[PDB]
Amino acid sequence: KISQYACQRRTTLNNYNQLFTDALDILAENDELRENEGSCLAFMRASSVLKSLPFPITSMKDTEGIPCLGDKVKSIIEGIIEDGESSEAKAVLNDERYKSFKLFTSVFGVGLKTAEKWFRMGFRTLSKIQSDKSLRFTQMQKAGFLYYEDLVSCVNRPEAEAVSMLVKEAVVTFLPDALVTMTGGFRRGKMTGHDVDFLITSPEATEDEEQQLLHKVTDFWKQQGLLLYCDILESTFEKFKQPSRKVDALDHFQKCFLILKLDHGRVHSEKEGKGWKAIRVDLVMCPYDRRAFALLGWTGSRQFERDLRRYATHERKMMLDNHALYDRTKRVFLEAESEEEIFAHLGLDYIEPWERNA
Ligand SMILES: O=C(/C=C(\O)C(=O)O)/C=C/c1cc(C(=O)c2ccc(F)cc2)c[nH]1
Numbered sequence: 001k002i003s004q005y006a007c008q009r010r011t012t013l014n015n016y017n018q019l020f021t022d023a024l025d026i027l028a029e030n031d032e033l034r035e036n037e038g039s040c041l042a043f044m045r046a047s048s049v050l051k052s053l054p055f056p057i058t059s060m061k062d063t064e065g066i067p068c069l070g071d072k073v074k075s076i077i078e079g080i081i082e083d084g085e086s087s088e089a090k091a092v093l094n095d096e097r098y099k100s101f102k103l104f105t106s107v108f109g110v111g112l113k114t115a116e117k118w119f120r121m122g123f124r125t126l127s128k129i130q131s132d133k134s135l136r137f138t139q140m141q142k143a144g145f146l147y148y149e150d151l152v153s154c155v156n157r158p159e160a161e162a163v164s165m166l167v168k169e170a171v172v173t174f175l176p177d178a179l180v181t182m183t184g185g186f187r188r189g190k191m192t193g194h195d196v197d198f199l200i201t202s203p204e205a206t207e208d209e210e211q212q213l214l215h216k217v218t219d220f221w222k223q224q225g226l227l228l229y230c231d232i233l234e235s236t237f238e239k240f241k242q243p244s245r246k247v248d249a250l251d252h253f254q255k256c257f258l259i260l261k262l263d264h265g266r267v268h269s270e271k272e273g274k275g276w277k278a279i280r281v282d283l284v285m286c287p288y289d290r291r292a293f294a295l296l297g298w299t300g301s302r303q304f305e306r307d308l309r310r311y312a313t314h315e316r317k318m319m320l321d322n323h324a325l326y327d328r329t330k331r332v333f334l335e336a337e338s339e340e341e342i343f344a345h346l347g348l349d350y351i352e353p354w355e356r357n358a
């Protein structure tokens, strides 16, 4: 029996149903663009469960006993079995609004509202947007356009490792006891990513020292000429607040969204140009006692996190977010030194990071 929850499934990167899930992911993305939250969620849960299968679907009989597969989803699977393609996903790929939204939001600093605004102005290409003399761009969008080609190219593991070295070298200069962990997709075993994310924590730093680290590290990189873009969001973390009730919980830890200059010489790969590459990097600083909750939240995937929080609420009467775990029956906050302890508190078998690709 396959569970309806991604947190009770092992989802590895050997996806045997990419033909089905690529189509479901496109339909889910279109429903996000069309602001249809419900239809989006149904396609995301169906795609997620098929990603967990240890075999490819080759007939409709193979879908028996699989949860999260409604009639609409089963019609899409049937169509792919029939001709090897999804007519529904093909129509989304050829839709002008979908194409514009994907293209415009591929720029760093451009979200749903700006993409919609540009579309309703009649823009269809990034060339026409950039060269327009009436348009006004945010500092984030300026960086997004300036380093577009580098940011649209996939970050590989030798590059992520080169960034990790830079992060660790800068961090230990100001906090020598600090623990730096690469999170996101690369922690889950992915070969590529659009960015490189890190969690930083220190067992001996004060509240002030931990607040100043991201400012010190970014000033050091600015001095070294490696900081191409920097936005530091101060913490809004509340030590004694109950965890979030929301479907998608907000992270209140101090964080920064960066673009770093990665010199080619620092990358130790199998393999020209300007000799450097712009890399999107996110840094998160958390208090030492909350490191397991933050690690669990930042490792992902987004679907794994949604189902973890849904399972905690609906099955265990517990409240989980990136900062804490609260037991509503015992009326106590639950402590954890590792992700394993969080899973044990929830009554879940431990799911390895490479098994969280839901
Ligand atoms: O790629 C996926 C998900 C899909 O692939 C899928 O579910 O199918 C997410 C990975 C992921 C999530 C993040 C965040 O950026 C993040 C996390 C918490 C937060 F509060 C703010 C930002 C880092 N790891």
Ligand code: NA
Pocket (backbone or CB within 6 Å): 104, 105, 106, 107, 108, 109, 110, 111
């Ligand atoms: Na964007």
